[PDB]
Amino acid sequence: MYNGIGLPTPRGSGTNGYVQRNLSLV
Amino acid sequence: EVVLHEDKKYYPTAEEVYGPEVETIVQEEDTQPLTEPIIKPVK
Amino acid sequence: AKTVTKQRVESHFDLELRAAVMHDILDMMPEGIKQNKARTILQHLSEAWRCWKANIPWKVPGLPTPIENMILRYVKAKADWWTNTAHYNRERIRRGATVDKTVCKKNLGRLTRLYLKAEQERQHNYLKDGPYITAEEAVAVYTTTVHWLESRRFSPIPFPPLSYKHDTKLLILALERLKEAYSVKSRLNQSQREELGLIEQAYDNPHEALSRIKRHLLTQRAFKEVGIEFMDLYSHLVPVYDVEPLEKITDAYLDQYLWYEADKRRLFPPWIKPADTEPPPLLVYKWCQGINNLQDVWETSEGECNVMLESRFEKMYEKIDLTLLNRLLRLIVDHNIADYMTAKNNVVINYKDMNHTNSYGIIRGLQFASFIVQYYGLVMDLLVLGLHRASEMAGPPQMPNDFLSFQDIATEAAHPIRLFCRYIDRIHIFFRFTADEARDLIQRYLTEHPDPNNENIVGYNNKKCWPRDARMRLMKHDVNLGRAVFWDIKNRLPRSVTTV
Amino acid sequence: PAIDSFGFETDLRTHTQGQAFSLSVFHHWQIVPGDPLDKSIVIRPLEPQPAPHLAREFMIKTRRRKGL
Amino acid sequence: QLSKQYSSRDLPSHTKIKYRQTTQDAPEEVRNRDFRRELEERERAAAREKNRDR
Amino acid sequence: WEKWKKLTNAQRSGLNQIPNRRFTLWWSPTINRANVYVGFQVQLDL
Amino acid sequence: TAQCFLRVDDESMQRFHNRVRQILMASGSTTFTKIVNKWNTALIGLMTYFREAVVNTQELLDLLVKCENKIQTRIKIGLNSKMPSRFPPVVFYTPKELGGLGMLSMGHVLI
Amino acid sequence: VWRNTEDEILKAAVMKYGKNQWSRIASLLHRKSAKQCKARWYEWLDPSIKKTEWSREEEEKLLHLAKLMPTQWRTIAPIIGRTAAQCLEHYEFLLDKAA
Amino acid sequence: WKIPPCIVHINENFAKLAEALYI
Amino acid sequence: FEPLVRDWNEFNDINKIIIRQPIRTEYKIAFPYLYNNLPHHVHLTWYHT
Amino acid sequence: KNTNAETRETLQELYKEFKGDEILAATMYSTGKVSASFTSTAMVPETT
Amino acid sequence: TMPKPQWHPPWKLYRVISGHLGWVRCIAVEPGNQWFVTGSADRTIKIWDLASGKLKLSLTGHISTVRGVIVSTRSPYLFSCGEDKQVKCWDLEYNKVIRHYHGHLSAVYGLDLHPTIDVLVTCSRDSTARIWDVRTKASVHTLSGHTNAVATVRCQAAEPQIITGSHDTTIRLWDLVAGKTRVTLTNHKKSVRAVVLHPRHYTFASGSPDNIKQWKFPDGSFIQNLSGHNAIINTLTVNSDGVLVSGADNGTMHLWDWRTGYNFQRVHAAVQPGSLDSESGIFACAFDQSESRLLTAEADKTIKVYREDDTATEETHPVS
């Protein structure tokens, strides 16, 4: 889910733009 | 009337060079963005 | 039939400019029946362009008018093209579109020429429209500096004595500072090889040197010429001045000497702040921690208002005035040193082939120019604070204060201006107003600059980096206090000296 | 609740690969678990309020839009 | 002496001419129009606009 | 690791290739591996 | 009695970015290790000045990711390939005693 | 410094090549560089620099300026037509004759 | 129509300034 | 895909909202016009097969 | 400017004793002032 | 002498538009009279509203001075022509270049459109003209035979269809379908940079620094001289009502009677504030389609708009 997180396009950003959720959230 | 170089108007102004009845537009930046066609298409 | 691409754009512009000329007059407003010397009117045209570019008044003595008007018209066409191209590329470079490496250099050279044309004009306008500072403002500034120094009980700085004890320490520091330039010992050049030679021989025989120095300082008032060039920081340029090594050594020494003596005699009060006691991250800490320790600073119960205003002095190094500055230096140093400094700012400044003479501002690439800028900024701290509050901040001359301290709480709370720091020419002031001080300030503001149409809210600029939960909130009373405070501070500074 | 009725269709069809399918109608009103009038209940303004305060917030936000 | 060389740019493209239609401004309506009074109208309308402007 | 005469233009400028050359020789079983994406195989000369 | 929230200024981010830009621009006449010595100097000069304003500025963290990986990419382009498996991290971050290049990193954070 | 021989080699070079090609003239000279060449020509060997005695109006103007614009010799000099080193020495010389 | 072949001001308030300062 | 084209609002005021279930992109695609401003060049696909 | 006695008495004595000046007073095809002032910013602009 | 000329009212300056950043070199009016179009030596093509003079839009495609623009009566097309040797076809429904005619070998000094067929004529400095097929971008004919820059070209539906005036000081009337020169008029002594055709009189005029000349179709026979305007003549433009405007290159613009050859008015405008006086000069003139307004495009980066004077009479302005 692109829930308003991440990049529009991970194209010219120097990353793969991969997103994850902060596992230590609580 | 000591005229700090920041102001220093040479160059008589427009109204004074042309006169009181001729209008004077100055159009730098334009209206009407590029994507709005001049001639429109029909539908 | 090949296109015009990117490498033939300048070449093609000139093919067609000089074709157009040859069509234009040298064959359609002749009557030079013989053989119309078009090959020579084109030579004028190219020298008219070189002279425009070098800022030389080009006039060929006898040359018919139609030809002179044709040439002037076409040089102005080429100059409009050249300048608009410089604008265009500078925007591209500033935001980041080219990496091309000949455009970066062509454009640094184009804007250096344009800056020097603007500058030679500004010096001519000085000598024509006369000292911009009146004979009433100059006298108020002079008299106010005298009252400062006399209430401080300053003790003017004397000529570096003959058997002074510290001079080899001061000269050793000078030369260490100068070698730091050539730390790497690269391919440097002839001129840097020669400067390194001078440093080493004056490192070996430290008294031939000091003899030479004090001789210069005593007799010389006409110096060589300095060269200029720019350092391109991709978002703006920085001037970089190149002075001759002999005088570089005499100034390095004078720099060290003036700063040592000024700090021993306590010339600069504690709010003048690139100071040696802390780094900038520590000043930010001390400012936050000075605000927070003001007395009842966070209370709004009775309707107070704190205002933190911060700005810049907007051209000080460039409307310093060498005659007023000579006299204001004489209040402080030995008339010999005052004259050396002031005559050393007035040199010939030279880039590839353009030359002009500095007469108005200050060369910031001299080595005592730190001293001159901070002393002038002291005078303008005095015009902003007034002598009474500036003397409360600096505390009694027998018992100075530290950076943002006062003596008691009465004196600290006796005025709206609670803190003041002036980095080299950046100004950060902190006011604390009561309800009626604020109301009267805003009254006298509106009386003069009336805002009936609630348009004060529009100009206000905040920080679009915090969330709106954390930015500034523009209510009527707030933005009107902000503007009144600024309007009141910008009125203390004559416009011929500096502005805001 | 009409509150949590939103997008539940998409949530269900997504989780079950469209196998299930939901149709909805209003059926009746009911008491919301909230105490509409308590001042000591404050709003963490974006985190989801637990049941004791649904009507408290409901009032605050609804008037904040409309009732002042 | 017509060569067989060729070009990427001379490939067929844009092969129909858009003719100016009825509503845009066909040479017919230009055959009709009264221009002087129409122009006088619009110029007055603009002057009124920039009057209300200031 | 590894603690006059007058030179023409292209000697007084242009990089020195030797330290690049030896960085590549040192790191070379990585810069020259076999599991690659696209790349067409070739035998060094002799 | 109060808290100060810090951030790096916008014009200081832009000045860092222009400084890296002229590293990359004047590096077709430097050797890999001098490109990385200039990167190391600029990045220490930023981190040791700001030091916790950098943690709180979410726009720096991106600037540093993109700028670090532009420097790495100029070294690849200096050799003649950008294949990501010819150049694992080991060749850039290995200290200079073990023969690597000796980069110092701040772009391997999670943003 | 400078010696009759070099000064004349300079003179000859300049008068041939022209007064903006400083690098080649420097190349003719052994141990002299274009900065020094240019300075020497524009202060001592240029023939529009006059080494004569001061008209009385020259001098009275001199003192008038040196009072108007104190220690700015490069700015003063062209307004009276000698180089700033000449102007400076003669101003101290009038000051000391009246000392 | 023959063509040849190609190849200071000072205000007076400076005075009143300087002498106002000496006074 | 690469993005098709490229200050203050009141409906986004955080004091006036009630987040009981947080919006997600599945909803914003299921109902293009209800859950999105300026929804342009959009196909509204639905199926209750 | 009523700032102090130094300034009041200064301007008094200045407007009293100060009289007009002498040296700088005196010393402050076509011709070519156009072309000169156009390819040189260090001149006052003539446009004719 | 001649009959007595008609009395025409005078024209008075009434607007001065300023937005360009270099010489303004060509100007043209829409068919339907809503907007005119200027092409300038700052390389842009601006499109101005003709009522108010507001700038609606500016197109930037060229690489150098745009030296001529024109707008098609039959299709929603603008054709531009530049010093980069390129001729472009802007389509006005996306505001985009769609077509480009390649093949000249130096700056293209001017360009015209055929009103009946879709063909284009362009004249350039390589001393030739060319006939392009609007739709397949192909050169159907290369009108060669001049011996210098072909300063100007006009085309008409009657015969001959193509008239080019050049810098070797001669005029040629060309047969289009044949594609070769019928008649060669060598009456002018200095380069011919402007020629114009009467809307309803099978006649045409040709200007040069010597004097304007009037001539008669189709074999190009002398009719009369017109003299008085002794300056390099950049434009000639003729009204429906026998007004003939001749705008020159040293700024001055004279107004004449097409028929009797009597110069009744002489205008000398003043340059925009910061201009030299040698930066007065007129590059383009155009009558609007109501033939009520007269626009001019100037060497001081201005568009000067003149209108007809409504309160003058033969007894206010006697005719000589």
PDB file of N, CA and C in Angstrom, chain C residues 221 223-225 323 339 342-343 346 359, chain H residues 35 38 70-75 84 88:
ATOM      1  N   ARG C 221      52.362  55.843   1.101  1.00  0.00           N
ATOM      2  CA  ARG C 221      50.947  56.081   0.872  1.00  0.00           C
ATOM      3  C   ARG C 221      50.543  55.913  -0.581  1.00  0.00           C
ATOM      4  N   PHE C 223      50.471  52.645  -3.296  1.00  0.00           N
ATOM      5  CA  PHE C 223      50.748  51.224  -3.308  1.00  0.00           C
ATOM      6  C   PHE C 223      50.554  50.688  -4.709  1.00  0.00           C
ATOM      7  N   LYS C 224      50.890  49.428  -4.905  1.00  0.00           N
ATOM      8  CA  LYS C 224      50.768  48.848  -6.222  1.00  0.00           C
ATOM      9  C   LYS C 224      49.304  48.587  -6.514  1.00  0.00           C
ATOM     10  N   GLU C 225      49.028  47.864  -7.582  1.00  0.00           N
ATOM     11  CA  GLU C 225      47.643  47.590  -7.892  1.00  0.00           C
ATOM     12  C   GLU C 225      47.308  46.146  -7.578  1.00  0.00           C
ATOM     13  N   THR C 323      37.035  59.061   3.609  1.00  0.00           N
ATOM     14  CA  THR C 323      37.452  60.226   4.383  1.00  0.00           C
ATOM     15  C   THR C 323      36.872  60.195   5.785  1.00  0.00           C
ATOM     16  N   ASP C 339      46.467  56.621   8.518  1.00  0.00           N
ATOM     17  CA  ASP C 339      46.694  57.011   7.136  1.00  0.00           C
ATOM     18  C   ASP C 339      47.155  55.862   6.271  1.00  0.00           C
ATOM     19  N   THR C 342      43.961  53.832   5.448  1.00  0.00           N
ATOM     20  CA  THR C 342      43.013  54.490   4.570  1.00  0.00           C
ATOM     21  C   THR C 342      43.580  54.723   3.191  1.00  0.00           C
ATOM     22  N   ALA C 343      44.877  54.877   3.066  1.00  0.00           N
ATOM     23  CA  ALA C 343      45.433  55.016   1.738  1.00  0.00           C
ATOM     24  C   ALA C 343      45.661  53.689   1.086  1.00  0.00           C
ATOM     25  N   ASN C 346      42.722  52.487  -1.238  1.00  0.00           N
ATOM     26  CA  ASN C 346      42.448  53.251  -2.437  1.00  0.00           C
ATOM     27  C   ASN C 346      43.529  52.879  -3.430  1.00  0.00           C
ATOM     28  N   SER C 359      37.637  54.187  -4.821  1.00  0.00           N
ATOM     29  CA  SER C 359      37.588  55.430  -4.109  1.00  0.00           C
ATOM     30  C   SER C 359      36.493  55.487  -3.095  1.00  0.00           C
TER      31      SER C 359
ATOM     32  N   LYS H  35      54.223  41.343 -14.689  1.00  0.00           N
ATOM     33  CA  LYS H  35      53.800  42.323 -13.697  1.00  0.00           C
ATOM     34  C   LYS H  35      54.799  43.462 -13.617  1.00  0.00           C
ATOM     35  N   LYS H  38      54.938  45.619 -16.844  1.00  0.00           N
ATOM     36  CA  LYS H  38      53.823  46.541 -16.977  1.00  0.00           C
ATOM     37  C   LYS H  38      53.964  47.699 -16.011  1.00  0.00           C
ATOM     38  N   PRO H  70      42.318  63.128   1.925  1.00  0.00           N
ATOM     39  CA  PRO H  70      43.631  62.875   2.511  1.00  0.00           C
ATOM     40  C   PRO H  70      44.034  61.419   2.392  1.00  0.00           C
ATOM     41  N   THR H  71      45.218  61.195   1.835  1.00  0.00           N
ATOM     42  CA  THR H  71      45.930  59.932   1.631  1.00  0.00           C
ATOM     43  C   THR H  71      45.442  59.113   0.462  1.00  0.00           C
ATOM     44  N   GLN H  72      44.616  59.655  -0.410  1.00  0.00           N
ATOM     45  CA  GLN H  72      44.147  58.913  -1.557  1.00  0.00           C
ATOM     46  C   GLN H  72      44.944  59.387  -2.756  1.00  0.00           C
ATOM     47  N   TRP H  73      46.134  58.842  -2.899  1.00  0.00           N
ATOM     48  CA  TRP H  73      47.027  59.327  -3.922  1.00  0.00           C
ATOM     49  C   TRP H  73      46.687  58.802  -5.291  1.00  0.00           C
ATOM     50  N   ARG H  74      46.231  57.567  -5.421  1.00  0.00           N
ATOM     51  CA  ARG H  74      45.828  57.112  -6.735  1.00  0.00           C
ATOM     52  C   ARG H  74      44.640  57.879  -7.257  1.00  0.00           C
ATOM     53  N   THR H  75      43.774  58.345  -6.383  1.00  0.00           N
ATOM     54  CA  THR H  75      42.614  59.104  -6.800  1.00  0.00           C
ATOM     55  C   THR H  75      42.977  60.532  -7.095  1.00  0.00           C
ATOM     56  N   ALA H  84      51.156  58.930  -8.839  1.00  0.00           N
ATOM     57  CA  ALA H  84      50.878  59.126  -7.427  1.00  0.00           C
ATOM     58  C   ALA H  84      52.143  59.131  -6.596  1.00  0.00           C
ATOM     59  N   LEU H  88      53.078  62.192  -4.214  1.00  0.00           N
ATOM     60  CA  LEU H  88      53.282  61.954  -2.798  1.00  0.00           C
ATOM     61  C   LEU H  88      54.584  62.562  -2.332  1.00  0.00           C
TER      62      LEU H  88
END
